[PDB]
Design a protein around this nucleic acid. Structure first.
Ligand code: MG
Ligand code: MG
Ligand code: MG
Ligand code: MG
Ligand code: MG
Ligand code: MG
Ligand code: MG
Ligand code: MG
Ligand code: MG
Ligand code: MG
Ligand code: MG
Ligand code: MG
Ligand code: MG
Ligand code: MG
Ligand code: MG
Ligand code: MG
Ligand code: MG
Ligand code: MG
Ligand code: MG
Ligand code: MG
Ligand code: MG
Ligand code: MG
Ligand code: MG
Ligand code: MG
Ligand code: MG
Ligand code: MG
Ligand code: MG
Lengths: 205, 79, 129, 156, 123
RNA sequence: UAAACGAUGUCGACUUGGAGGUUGUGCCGGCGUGGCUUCCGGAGCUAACGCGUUAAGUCGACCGCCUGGGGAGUAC
RNA sequence: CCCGCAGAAGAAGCACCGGCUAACUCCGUGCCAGCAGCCGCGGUAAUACGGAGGGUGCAAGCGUUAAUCGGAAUUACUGGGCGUAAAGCGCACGCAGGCGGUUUGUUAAGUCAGAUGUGAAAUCCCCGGGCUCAACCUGGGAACUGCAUCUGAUACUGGCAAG
RNA sequence: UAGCUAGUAGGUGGGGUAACGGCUCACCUAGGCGACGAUCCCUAGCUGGUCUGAGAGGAUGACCAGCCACACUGGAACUGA
């Protein structure tokens, strides 16, 4: 129900940084990021169009740490919701509580944010929520519980987030360890490297 | 109003009874072509007024025999 | 034998356009005149006229834009072997609204947009695009 | 500047006195992503030469397609030989819902949202021709208004 | 066909008979082995394929393939069969389930156990 | 019952041409105007071959018929 | 449900990797043993059999079988064909049936418009609300494309009358 | 599977039922059903819905709710609203 294996294999297969490490070091100094894993990694056998769609889907899944059944349900919800299906899917993924905890800088990675959520360190609107997939809505306040404010993990994670592009759809107070989900991100707020139409097409087959 | 049906007499060989073919024009549920469909009713004809070929107006009543639950109203146009 | 004069008129238009005829002529009828009136006011034909007392003949002036016939497609929909009626909610759009459907309503023969605006359905005569 | 896609490589053969002579065919499409698309078909003894010939031909056979903000103007049908295709406008975020050779053509032409179906033969050379034919016989509101002597508002 | 013709005689669907009739729309059936045999395939293949003739609980007598290397089936053995034909063996349209009832699993098998009757090696 | 064949159901309308055959008819060997018919060919159509105003083109009305090869136009 | 306690401790498997189809190599075998959904693979230099290393896909499940719809526009109403691929009855007359040139009047059956009654609740869908989330539960709507009746319209189709 | 039907179809009168009714009986007429598929044969509980499908369709009727039928097999009435 969670991927527990080596992390940089996933990035190396996707051929890009999935941000599955804290980012204290460059991912180059920890692995051969330009080479796919395994004995025949250096090879680069032509990828079919199906392969391209599959790899895009897997890359987004692995960024956010979502298994296939949950991800498929996300696609179904995005298709049901009014508007652009791929943008809806990205918005749903960004709304996850573990992802929001990471985006506010409380967790060094999304897996650390997930553990913070799971281990009951996170409050949404003053109430403990330990569900990683909980959907945060606009104007919600996400805070570190008082018992967890002394954790060195969280201070280090806030330091790390200081050295990333700050999301504009959130408002974090690193002193009180509180953040506000102002609005759902638009597509411009998310990376232009994600090609979500490929995921939509994959699931529409 | 009174609910009525209009049709062609196709048999009058029963005492005080006739058989009336009612015609309906219905759209075919699959092909959409409007087709003609027939309903045959045993109708009570007191006075034995109707002949084969007349066009009669009928109305529904209580059962009068095993197969009769309609009675003559009038002959709209005779044969 | 001749059993659909409207399909005949549509076919005469289609074939005359394919042959680059400047005009086509057919025996007239009031229904054909109503359809031709819709065609003219929608810009698909230049003009029409009826001549003759006892055997009226309807002449349609065809139009061409840039070496191409203006009537790109013209298609019978309701026909004697299968009549097609639509309520106002289900009036067809032709070429996503860039064409027309010619509809016989109880207020007369008009385009599908005009029938929609008048809140009527009717018989779908033809599609013109 | 132009997107280039290779659709199919096929090995063909002719017979001679000594035996069989094998050669290769390449079917490619090129497009500018903004309504210009062309297809090329090349043959050569070797695959890279066939592909290069196909690319050269494709760059010289591009036609113009009047797209409406990444989708089609209206439903269209295209035909060539045994291949019959149907294409439809779709809302934003509908991807290219299309099969095979159609996908390549529509991608390089700049169609981002479309619902399509291929009928008859799905042979790639003929499917490409039918898809381009369908995109060619598609009208914009401006062209319809122009040919009918109307303004665009009274058209729509 | 015209619409009138279809009103008189509508479009007729095909029946699509089952290729595994002896199962009678059951996922598996139990049977007793009537003989354990070995047979030669159609061209262009050649080997000695292991098959059993089995009388199923519903009275059908059918031949079923014994997949994998090295069965223990020896007549009066009661087995479980599932659907699935062997292409190069005429008349063989069932597989016996390895590891069910009297059919043992394949002995030294890794890699797709559970299609044969093999427990996880573990220790 | 036949490869009973144009291997092409019947009826109607419409849509560039050329060269003949046959059989009427009007006017002055010429110019028209009908019926049937042979060959070529244009658009269009067709998988192609080809068809092409006698359509396999563009349409309408109605009917007959097809649904992988074999088993079989067989068995009952 | 909440709060304390101890410690990463008590918690990972299954199918696949010739093409379709994401994922490749070595040793073992030698048309054998075996694989196989289709195409096929195996006769010494096997990414196709078997084991391993590596990899891919799913994951507290994963595969297989059965079974339905889809893909199949492959029964084609939407939406197919019939010169040669399967397909025009050997030809015709003709009842039932289907279809019907043109004008006016009338009718208002088809058709169309509005309304009324009904179309159980649940379900589906939309908007909200409750279980930490979700599944689940749930408030209002939409929808139930139908049927009947009443009142209108009269272009088209039908009836009737005259041409 | 092309013919089926003599309480059979209709009428009159008596009886009968909570009630109309060949429901039943007597008499009279000779009808009634059927290629818009009667009769016969095989299969089957029906619906709301469910699965699939872009839709039109196709498949289906477990759970939940409505209707029906049955209660070892065949038959019968009694009591009772
Ligand atoms: Mg789970
Ligand atoms: Mg009764
Ligand atoms: Mg095909
Ligand atoms: Mg014969
Ligand atoms: Mg002869
Ligand atoms: Mg001959
Ligand atoms: Mg013949
Ligand atoms: Mg010719
Ligand atoms: Mg015989
Ligand atoms: Mg691959
Ligand atoms: Mg070897
Ligand atoms: Mg189908
Ligand atoms: Mg076909
Ligand atoms: Mg032949
Ligand atoms: Mg043939
Ligand atoms: Mg013939
Ligand atoms: Mg005849
Ligand atoms: Mg008429
Ligand atoms: Mg009416
Ligand atoms: Mg309801
Ligand atoms: Mg809530
Ligand atoms: Mg509700
Ligand atoms: Mg009239
Ligand atoms: Mg039963
Ligand atoms: Mg479909
Ligand atoms: Mg049913
Ligand atoms: Mg009593």
């Amino acid at each position: 129900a969670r991927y527990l294996g080596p992390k940089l294999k996933l990035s190396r297969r996707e051929g890009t940084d999935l941000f599955l490490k804290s980012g204290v070091r460059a991912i180059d100094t920890k692995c051969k990021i330009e080479q796919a894993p395994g004995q025949h990694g250096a090879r680069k056998p032509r990828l079919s169009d199906y392969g391209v769609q599959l790899r895009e889907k897997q890359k987004v899944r692995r960024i956010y740490g979502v298994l296939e059944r949950q991800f498929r349900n996300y696609y179904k919800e995005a298709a049901r919701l009014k508007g652009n299906t791929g943008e809806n899917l990205l918005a749903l993924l960004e709304g996850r509580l573990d992802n929001v905890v990471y985006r506010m800088g409380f967790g060094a990675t999304r897996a650390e944010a997930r553990q913070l959520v799971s281990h009951k360190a996170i409050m949404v609107n003053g109430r403990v929520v330990n569900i990683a997939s909980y959907q945060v809505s606009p104007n919600d306040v996400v805070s570190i519980r008082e018992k967890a404010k002394k954790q060195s993990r969280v201070k280090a994670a806030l330091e790390l987030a200081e050295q990333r592009e700050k999301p504009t759809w959130l408002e974090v107070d690193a002193g009180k360890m509180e953040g506000t989900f102002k609005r759902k991100p638009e597509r411009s707020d998310l990376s232009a490297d994600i090609n979500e139409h490929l995921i939509v097409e994959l699931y529409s087959k | 109003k009174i609910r009525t049906l209009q049709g062609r007499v196709v048999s009058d060989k029963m005492e005080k009874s006739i058989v009336v073919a009612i015609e309906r024009f219905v759209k075919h549920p699959i092909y959409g072509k409007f087709i003609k469909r027939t309903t045959k009713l045993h109708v009570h004809d007191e006075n034995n007024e109707c002949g084969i070929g007349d066009v009669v107006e009928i109305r529904e009543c209580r059962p009068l025999s095993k197969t009769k639950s309609w009675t003559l109203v009038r002959v709209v146009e005779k044969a | 034998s001749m059993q659909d004069p409207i399909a005949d008129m549509l076919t005469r238009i289609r074939n005359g356009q394919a042959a680059n005829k400047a005009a086509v002529t057919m025996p007239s009828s009031k229904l054909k005149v109503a359809i031709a009136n819709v065609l003219k006011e929608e810009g698909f034909i230049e003009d029409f006229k009826v001549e003759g007392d006892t055997k009226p003949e309807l002449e349609l002036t065809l139009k061409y834009f840039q070496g191409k016939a203006v009537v790109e497609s013209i298609q019978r929909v309701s026909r004697p072997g299968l009549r097609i009626y639509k309520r106002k909610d289900e009036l067809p759009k032709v070429m996503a609204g860039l064409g027309i459907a010619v509809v016989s309503t109880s207020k007369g023969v008009m385009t599908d947009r005009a029938a929609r605006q008048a809140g009527l359905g009717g018989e779908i005569i033809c599609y013109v695009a | 500047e132009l997107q280039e896609k290779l659709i199919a490589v096929n090995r063909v053969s002719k017979t001679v006195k000594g035996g069989r002579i094998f050669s290769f065919t390449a079917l490619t499409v090129v497009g500018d992503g903004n309504g210009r698309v062309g297809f090329g078909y090349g043959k050569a003894r070797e695959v890279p030469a066939a592909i290069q010939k196909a690319m050269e031909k494709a760059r010289r056979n591009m036609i113009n397609v009047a797209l409406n903000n990444g989708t089609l103007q209206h439903p269209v049908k295209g035909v060539h030989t045994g291949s019959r295709v149907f294409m439809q406008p779709a809302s934003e975020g509908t991807g290219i819902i299309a099969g095979g050779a159609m996908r390549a053509v529509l991608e390089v032409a700049g169609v981002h949202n479309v619902l399509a179906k291929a009928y008859g033969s799905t042979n790639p050379i003929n499917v490409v021709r039918a898809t381009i034919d369908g995109l060619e016989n598609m009208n914009s509101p401006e062209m319809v208004a122009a040919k009918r002597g109307k303004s665009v508002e009274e058209i729509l | 066909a015209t619409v009138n013709q279809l009103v008189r005689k509508p479009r007729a669907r095909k029946v699509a008979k089952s290729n595994v009739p002896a199962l009678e729309a059951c996922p598996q059936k139990r049977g007793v082995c009537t003989r354990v045999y070995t047979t030669t395939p159609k061209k262009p293949n050649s080997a000695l394929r292991k098959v059993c003739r089995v009388r199923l609980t519903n009275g059908f007598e059918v031949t079923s393939y014994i997949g994998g290397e090295g069965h223990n089936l020896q007549e009066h053995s009661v087995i479980l069969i599932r659907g699935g034909r062997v292409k190069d063996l005429p008349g063989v349209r069932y597989h016996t389930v390895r590891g069910a009832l009297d059919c043992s699993g394949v002995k030294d098998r890794k890699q797709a156990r559970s299609k044969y009757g093999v427990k996880r090696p573990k220790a």
